[PDB]
Amino acid sequence: LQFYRNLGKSGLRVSCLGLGTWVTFGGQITDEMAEQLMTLAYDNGINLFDTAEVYAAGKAEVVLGNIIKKKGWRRSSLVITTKIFWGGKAETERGLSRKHIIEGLKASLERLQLEYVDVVFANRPDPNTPMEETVRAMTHVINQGMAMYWGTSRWSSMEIMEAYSVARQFNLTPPICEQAEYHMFQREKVEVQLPELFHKIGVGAMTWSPLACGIVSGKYDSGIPPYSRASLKGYQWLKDKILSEEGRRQQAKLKELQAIAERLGCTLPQLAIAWCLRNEGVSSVLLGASNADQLMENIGAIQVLPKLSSSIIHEIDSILGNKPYS
Amino acid sequence: LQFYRNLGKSGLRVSCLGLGTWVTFGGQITDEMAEQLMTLAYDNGINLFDTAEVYAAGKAEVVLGNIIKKKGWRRSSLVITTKIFWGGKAETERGLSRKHIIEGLKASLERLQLEYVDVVFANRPDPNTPMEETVRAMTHVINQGMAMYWGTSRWSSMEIMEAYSVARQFNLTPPICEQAEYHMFQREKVEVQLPELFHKIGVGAMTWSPLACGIVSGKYDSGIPPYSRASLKGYQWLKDKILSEEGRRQQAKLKELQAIAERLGCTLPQLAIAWCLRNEGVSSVLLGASNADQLMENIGAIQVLPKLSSSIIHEIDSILGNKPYS
Amino acid sequence: LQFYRNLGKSGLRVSCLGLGTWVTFGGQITDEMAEQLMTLAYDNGINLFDTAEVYAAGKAEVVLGNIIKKKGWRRSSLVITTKIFWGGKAETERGLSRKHIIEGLKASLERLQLEYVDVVFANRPDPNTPMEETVRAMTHVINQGMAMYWGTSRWSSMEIMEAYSVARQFNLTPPICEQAEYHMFQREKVEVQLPELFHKIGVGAMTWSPLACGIVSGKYDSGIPPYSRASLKGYQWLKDKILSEEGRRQQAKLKELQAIAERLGCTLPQLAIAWCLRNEGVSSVLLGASNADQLMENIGAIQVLPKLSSSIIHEIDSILGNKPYS
Amino acid sequence: LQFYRNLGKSGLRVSCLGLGTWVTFGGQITDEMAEQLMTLAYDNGINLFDTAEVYAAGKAEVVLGNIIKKKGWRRSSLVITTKIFWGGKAETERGLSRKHIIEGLKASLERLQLEYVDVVFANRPDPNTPMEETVRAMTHVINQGMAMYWGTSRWSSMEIMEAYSVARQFNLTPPICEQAEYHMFQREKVEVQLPELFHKIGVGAMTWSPLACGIVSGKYDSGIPPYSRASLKGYQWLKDKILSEEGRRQQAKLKELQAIAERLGCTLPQLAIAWCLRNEGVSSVLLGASNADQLMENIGAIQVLPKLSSSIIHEIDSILGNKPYS
Amino acid sequence: VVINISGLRFETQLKTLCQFPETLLGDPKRRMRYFDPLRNEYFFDRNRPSFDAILYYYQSGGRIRRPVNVPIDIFSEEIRFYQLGEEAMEKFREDEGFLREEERP
Amino acid sequence: VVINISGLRFETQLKTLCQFPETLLGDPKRRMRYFDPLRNEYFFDRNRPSFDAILYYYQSGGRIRRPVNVPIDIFSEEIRFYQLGEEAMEKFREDEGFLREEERP
Ligand SMILES: NC(=O)c1ccc[n+]([C@@H]2O[C@H](COP(=O)([O-])OP(=O)(O)OC[C@H]3O[C@@H](n4cnc5c(N)ncnc54)[C@H](OP(=O)(O)O)[C@@H]3O)[C@@H](O)[C@H]2O)c1
Ligand SMILES: NC(=O)c1ccc[n+]([C@@H]2O[C@H](COP(=O)([O-])OP(=O)(O)OC[C@H]3O[C@@H](n4cnc5c(N)ncnc54)[C@H](OP(=O)(O)O)[C@@H]3O)[C@@H](O)[C@H]2O)c1
Ligand SMILES: NC(=O)c1ccc[n+]([C@@H]2O[C@H](COP(=O)([O-])OP(=O)(O)OC[C@H]3O[C@@H](n4cnc5c(N)ncnc54)[C@H](OP(=O)(O)O)[C@@H]3O)[C@@H](O)[C@H]2O)c1
Ligand SMILES: NC(=O)c1ccc[n+]([C@@H]2O[C@H](COP(=O)([O-])OP(=O)(O)OC[C@H]3O[C@@H](n4cnc5c(N)ncnc54)[C@H](OP(=O)(O)O)[C@@H]3O)[C@@H](O)[C@H]2O)c1
């Protein structure tokens, strides 16, 4: 329906698709494909761009900050996020302490060459640091000007409620968003838990990896194609999930959904992206592409969403069968 | 009565007339008429100068910041305001979010070449952004030094009371003023609503467009004079309000008030400006002029106010007949 | 008794005498006498130096900031104060608003060439500005680093209690001191009112003009000596207070106290300074001198204080007779 | 057990040994031995480095800041502390006032050439300054960015509870640590008092001088060796504690503990360091060395700790006999 | 809205007080002199336990009780001070049992 | 959790309210419309002294009292509003002595 929607109940207006960053930027794909990938995504209305400080050991940000410096886009028209967690080998360089949030955002604001990011994310929950230190540290970088909002990522629905009860007590700022994984085979958290937080306290949801790193892309039925994600080093954990019997059963479940894709005049990635956007409790979907012909067919999946009637939803549920108990 | 009065219950002392800025500055009139218009207004005791960031697409501020840089006036003797709302084509460049208030005031503090404005105004209410984000954002730019006070504009009397109940809860700063339209044909809000807020919470009133963009100026009886406001492009909405039967009925009501102007040794703009200043619930009136001979006759309308007895008020009410139900 | 005492109940340690600044610095005396006056006062243990922004129309600070720049004293060993009130002809340049405290301290931190003063004083109470604006403005300049403490001057004992009930409510900083006039002929406020505030809330007292601008100095019995304070322009109000019958009655009361001065091996200024220091509710006395031979006899009045027994106090009370009703 | 443990309940992860700084750095040992002493301690996993502003009259920091500037270590991998108390001859240059914490940390951030220290310590309690001023001053330097945490040193267990009841009232930051002396002959405070604060409010313990300035090092049985600590000037108070009968009785108690050292394949300093680390209520031990062969045998005392069974603890208690009454 | 009866915080909605738009608390020009713009509340220096039955009169929609501790000469003043009207004053009458005297023919 | 009964702050644990997972306060979808995300509390505009015996019902584990000041037609509505159930409604019955009528054969 709406293209530009609010991030939860905050004032940030994000595009419903957002170009992410992983192994592609600074790693797998080159630097000229990266500048090509951003200019044909920014021109199609997408303003939300993600990164972190663990991607490519701090090289995914230098290839992202060089594009915006060269292309000359206004900073007021973009939304740049950044996650903080593992960015060092030392002991005092990974965590959600006050020393790492203030230093990690300051060092990742020179690789991006900016002056502030829009949202700064806590990449995973820290059990050693108390919750009062992480809420006080994220409010300090907002008030110094280094960010505008903050949000959690991979936190449970109890630790988001715990980092809100602290912020409403010490007069600090609560989080505005949450990054939770969401596709057709991991739909537990964003369907039964996060829609209750959106009505209670008003956090959003910014789902990541909607194609399960290319598993739902349908390229993994006959084996491993060359120059794919699983054919790179460090991704044996991905390849052992599709070579196993559990992944091939999902590949057996992808054959019937292939038939529902061609019925609606689309392909299977264009269904799986627009399947995530069928709700109102999801505020944006973080995409990912390796070349230009992958991306422009993914942005085209907005028009698939008005074709997504209640009948096609109700029988996709029959093929998957992993509807969570509500 | 008093020339320099307080802005509501705050500590800011403003002149009761203040030179505004619209289509004139940077648009209609030239740049040499603009520097002439400010030096013969600052020398007559007026210190309050208004602008915004939507006027002339961000060119009304460059012609205002160049005058104060050239004329060499002390910054401590002036009061410069600025409104924030529409200042971009993008989606994340118009609103009252935290991202636009902090960026829009920072970009409009380079076109003015200053270091801080005195009041920063919210130009119209935003329904998407919650009230806690706009009060927290306006308190952030005050504490960083980029402003001194803040106020609302075109907000209802409920959303000013809502942006005060938040500020007294989270220990933030409430607004000090409100810009509401006020002339002889729009006198509803500033007469029955805003005098109740001045006694309850202590906001002021800074009325804008006292001549209804030249309608009360008496130049629009025989048609459209050349080089007027209605004769410019983008002002068909003004011209269709005076060519309609509703505006000509107001022109029929301006013929009798023309007779009351010459009785008191003044003209009809000098009555209409001093008619607004007859209260104590109005703290300043924002003027507007196109040339020097328009302005010096408007500043002269201070002395008309001690001639404004209760008899002339009570029969001007009979000619207009739009006295609101109290 | 003790030389370096606390300023009230704060942590600031001030010398019990402090060299002030008025008509002498930048006005009456020259600039070479001024540098001579500071180096022979700083070497005798006095660290507290006063100024304001109305003295010599902003020239008493340029002659004070040039000495510390030239002599090369460490900033951590001094205590420099500054009062804010009248420092401009305009309407928005005098008051205790948020616009004048932030601008007046910033402009008076370039004439002093420092980065921060120690105490910033409100020179007289403002009836137009509400108390919540002046406490919020003085807490803003402390948190920005431009000052360290703040205090009131010429405020009544109710408006110091009102600027404390606000600061303990909105979580701001209360004042630490108060400048009240104190000599043998004005001893009402510092004896019956300010010792109750020192026990209740913990403010101090920093008395000013202990010789009543040279009236108690004994030089004004036979008339006006040349090159005195009363012989300068703008001081007719002083001269009409000593030429009147009321001042000559005080001169009649100074003849007997002249006899008590020579009994204790001192002169009459050395008694009147040490008469003020006989309490514990007074934390410092702000001196004032015109040449070197005036000052070194005034700093010597510390040793007169252990000679001040209860008998000499009880009969000085008999000569003056203005003991306030306790 | 664990090498890198949390500092109390905060998020700071410190090594259980930390190289301190006293008479050695900038004083006794040279500058080339100092750079040698840090590089062979940083390479063994120790990141916690201590200093203050009274050591060598402000020269222990210039020799510490020059090493990190030259060696090129990342600031995010270190933990640098600093204590504030006596750093001037003047009266307003020693204390825990707001004027000395803000100035003393700013001047000690140019001798270290850093931009922020990790913990800033209050070196001893101040009875003149109220507790609300010291908690407000330490929260001001944290929020300005000049530090990250703060802690107390030599404060009693009541003044740490008093500087916590204030911080939880005015919405400030409580301390996270406490430096208390701890060895075999001063074990009162860290064994019966500070383990109650770790469970109640969550402060840590960072013990200093574990060898009692070389008394437990076993070099002081036959007299004073040359080039020792007691053989330097200004350390007569140390020499009169080992030449007295009380210290020789401790030397009589060191002869039996010499026998327990060789039984476990270690020397007596390697026992005394690992004796302090046997608890969980102690978060780090601040070492001290004069040359390289002293230090590398002290870092080796980690492996002595798993040999420290309950039997060797229970009979070391029999030799000393100063077990506090629990 | 927040009402502070000499230290006790009573906090109810605005539409509850607007059910009776003729009383003290219902009229936005009569209660406006008891405002406190520093704490955003109305401060009355009245008896503490007598307001627990005044607020329940607005919430229930017309019923008048009397708490057990407050005597009758005290609770008859709070109905006179909050200007509840003679309709509410006579509803307090037969709740205490004392019926008013009938008009003579 | 914090419950704000028209100005009076009651603050209990979450596992106390989860002992009775069918009432108003026990069901996280029925009490969710009374939340207040600015102060992090639940705001009910009900009678003040009647909730002191509702909260003790959860804390003690099932007992129902009645405070002395609140009458029976008031306290019978708070059990109906907080949806304590007929088990708790009939436990309020014989506590007041009034036994229900037996079913005729
Ligand atoms: N907060 C966290 O903890 C966290 C952690 C990890 C990632 N993330 C975010 O998640 C975002 C999404 O990353 P993702 O790569 O996992 O999302 P994804 O959409 O599930 O992965 C897409 C991958 O499949 C391929 N692909 C996309 N469309 C295709 C199409 N039509 N046909 C064939 N192949 C197609 C692409 O190249 P290939 O064919 O070469 O595979 C791409 O690499 C990342 O950018 C990152 O910002 C967040
Ligand atoms: N907060 C908001 O949302 C908002 C929105 C809009 C404007 N404003 C403020 O309102 C302020 C007032 O603007 P305005 O122009 O609408 O006020 P105005 O006084 O009603 O308009 C005066 C216009 O009429 C003409 N005029 C003035 N005196 C005259 C006289 N004696 N005889 C003949 N013509 C005369 C002038 O030139 P012409 O004859 O050529 O017309 C001028 O353009 C603006 O400066 C702006 O700061 C605020
Ligand atoms: N907070 C406020 O509102 C406020 C207002 C005004 C002043 N103040 C402070 O008050 C401070 C004190 O100023 P003040 O001049 O009025 O104090 P003062 O001690 O009463 O005046 C001393 C004057 O008398 C003369 N004098 C001093 N000792 C003398 C001696 N042994 N023999 C003969 N003459 C002697 C000096 O030169 P002469 O002989 O030439 O007179 C000097 O000018 C000022 O520095 C200012 O900082 C504060
Ligand atoms: N917060 C406070 O108030 C405060 C006050 C004072 C100190 N401190 C901290 O305490 C820290 C520890 O200082 P410290 O010197 O007193 O600790 P220490 O470990 O008790 O003293 C060790 C001294 O003994 C010698 N030594 C060490 N190991 C030895 C070994 N195996 N064999 C022979 N000699 C050995 C060393 O050289 P020598 O043989 O030449 O003696 C060294 O000088 C300081 O760095 C400082 O940061 C804190």
* Amino acid (1-letter code) at residue D269: P
Distance from residue D229's CA to the centre of ligand 4 (Å): 9
Which of the residues of D are catalytic?
55
Judge contact between A123 and A52, C-beta under 8 A. yes
Q: Which of A177, A229, A275, A299 to mutate to test the pocket of ligand 1 (most atoms within 8 A of CB)?
A: A229
Q: Is C13 on the interface with D (CB under 8 A)?
A: yes
Q: Among residues 104-163 of chain B, which lie with CB inside 8 Å of chain A?
A: 104, 107, 126, 128-130, 133-134, 136, 140, 144
**Which of F1, F40, F41, F42 would best serve as a mutation to test chain A binding (most A beta carbons within 10 A)?**
F40
The 8-class DSSP code of residue B20 comes to -
Chosen for mutation from A200, A203, A326 (greatest number of chain F CBs closer than 10 Å) is: A200
Q: Are A125 and A158 in contact (CB under 8 A)?
A: no
A160 contacts A186 by C-beta, under 8 angstroms: no
Helix (H) or strand (E) holding B101: helix B98-107
CA dist C228 and A215 (Å) reads 96
Give the relative orientation of helices D131-143 and D157-165 as an angle to the nearest 10 degrees: 70
Residue nearest to atom 3 of ligand 1 (CA): A123
Binding site, annotated residues of A: 21-22, 28, 50, 123, 153-154, 179, 208-213, 219, 227, 229, 288, 290, 294, 297-298
The one catalytic residue among A55, A149, A182, A220: A55
Is B28 annotated in a binding site? The answer is: yes
B248 lines ligand 2 (CB under 6 A): no
Query: Contacts from D103-106 at CB under 8 Å and sequence distance 24+?
Result: D103/C75, D103/C76, D104/C76, D104/D53, D105/D141, D105/D146, D105/D147, D106/D146
Q: How far is the CA of B287 from the centre of ligand 2 (A)?
A: 6
Q: Kindly identify the ligand whose nearest atom is closest to the C-alpha of B48.
A: 2
Residue whose pair of structure tokens reads 């958290």 in the numeric block: A189
CA dist D81 and D206 (Å) reads: 11
B169, B196, B201: residue with CB nearest E37: B201
> What is the distance between the alpha carbons of residues F53 and F66, in angstroms, rounded to a whole number?
6
Q: Which candidate, D87, D91, D90, places its Cα nearest to that of D120?
A: D87
Locate the domains of chain D by residue range. Answer: 1-326
The answer to whether D241 and D247 are in contact (CB under 8 A) is: yes
Question: How many residues are recorded in chain B?
Answer: 326
Q: Which ligand is nearest to the CA of C54?
A: 3
Neighbours of chain A (3+ CB pairs under 8 A): B, D, F
Q: Which residues line ligand 4 at a C-beta cut-off of 6 Å?
A: D 20-22, 24, 50, 83, 123, 153-154, 179, 208-214, 217, 219, 228-229, 269, 286-290, 294, 297-298
Out of B38, B207, B211, give the residue to mutate to test ligand 2, the one with the largest number of ligand atoms within 8 Å of its CB. B211
Tokens of B114: 């200053």
CA proximity to B164, closest of B154, B156, B178, B174: B174
The SS3 of residue A25 is: helix
Residue A77's SS3 state is helix
Solved how?
A: cryo-EM
Residue D152 phi, psi (nearest 5): -105, 165
Query: Which residues 6+ apart lie within 8 Å of D243 measured at CB?
Result: none
Give dist(CA D140, CA D163) in Å, integer: 15
* C290 is an annotated ligand-binding site residue: yes
Residues of B in contact with A75 (CB under 8 A): 103
SS3 string of D200-224?
HCCCCCEEECCCCCCCCCCCCCCCC
Whose Cα sits closest to atom 32 in ligand 4?
D217
CA of C207 to the centre of ligand 1 (A): 73
- Six-digit token pair at C263? 């009994």
Residue F38: list chain B partners with CB under 8 A: 132, 166, 169
Closest ligand 1 atom, residue A216 Cα: 20
* CB contact set of C85 (below 8 Å; sequence gap of 6+): C52, C53, C54, C94, C95, C96, C122, C123, C124
Strand partners, C86: C94
CA angle B46, B47, B50 (to 5 degrees): 105
Instruction: Mark out chain B residues that contact chain F at CB-CB < 8 A.
Output: 132, 166, 169
- In angstroms, rounded to a whole number, what is the distance separating the alpha carbons of residues B166 and B185? 34
Mind telling me how many Å the CA of F38 is from chain B's nearest CA? 9
Residue D12 is encoded by which pair of tokens?
């700071």
Q: Do chain A and chain F touch with ≥3 beta carbon pairs under 8 Å?
A: yes
Query: How close is the Cα of D22 to the center of ligand 4, in Å?
Result: 7
What's the CA-to-centroid distance between C213 and ligand 3, angstroms?
5
CB of E32 less than 8 A from some CB of B = yes
Does the Cβ of A210 fall within 6 Å of ligand 1?
yes
Chosen for mutation from D76, D116, D173, D283 (greatest number of chain A CBs closer than 10 Å) is D76
- Distance (Å) from the alpha carbon of D138 to chain A's nearest alpha carbon: 15
Comparing alpha-carbon positions, the chain B residue that sits nearest to C171 is: B171
Instruction: Answer yes or no: do E12 and F6 touch at CB < 8 A.
Output: yes
How far apart CA C87 and CA C58 sit, in angstroms, is 8
Between CA B56 and CA C71 the distance in angstroms is 54
Contact check, Cβ <8 Å, F28/A196 = yes
B12 class by beta-carbon count within 10 Å (0-12 exposed, 13-18 middle, 19+ buried): buried
Q: Give kind and range of the element (H or E) at residue B285.
A: strand B284-287
| Atom 10 of ligand 3, nearest CA residue | C208
SS3 string, chain C, reads CCCEEECCCCCCEEECEEECCCCHHHHHCCHHHHHHHHHHHHCCCCCEECCCCCHHHCCCCHHHHHHHHHHCCCHHHCEEEEEECECCCCCCCECCCHHHHHHHHHHCCCCCCCCCCCEEEECCCCCCCCHHHHHHHHHHHHHCCCCCEEEEECCCHHHHHHHHHCCCCCCCCCCCCEECECCCCCCCHHHHCHHHHHHHCCCCCEEECCCCCCCCCCCCCCCCCCCCCCCCCCCHHHHHHHCCHHHHHHHHHHHHHHHHHHHCCCCHHHHHHHHHCCCCCCCEEEECCCCHHHHHHHHHHHCCHHHCCHHHHHHHHHHHCCCCCC
Residue C171 at interface with chain D, using a CB cutoff of 8 Å = yes
Cβ contacts of E11 on chain B, cutoff 8 Å: none
Q: How far apart are CA A106 and CA A84, in angstroms?
A: 11
Chains F and D make contact, 3+ CB pairs within 8 Å: no
Q: Which of B55, B164, B182, B220 is catalytic?
A: B55
Tokens found for residue A181? 């994984």
DSSP assignments along A214-236, one per residue: TTTTT--SSS--TTSSTTSTT-H
**Experimental resolution (Å):** 3.3
Cα torsion C188, C194, C195, C196 to 10°: value is 110
Q: Which residues of A118-155 are buried (b: 16+ CB within 10 A; e: fewer)?
A: bbbbbbebbeebbbbbbbbbbbbbbbbebbbbbbbbbb
C231 alpha carbon, closest ligand: 3
Measured at the alpha carbon of residue C49, what is the angle toward residues C43 and C51, in degrees to the nearest 5? 150
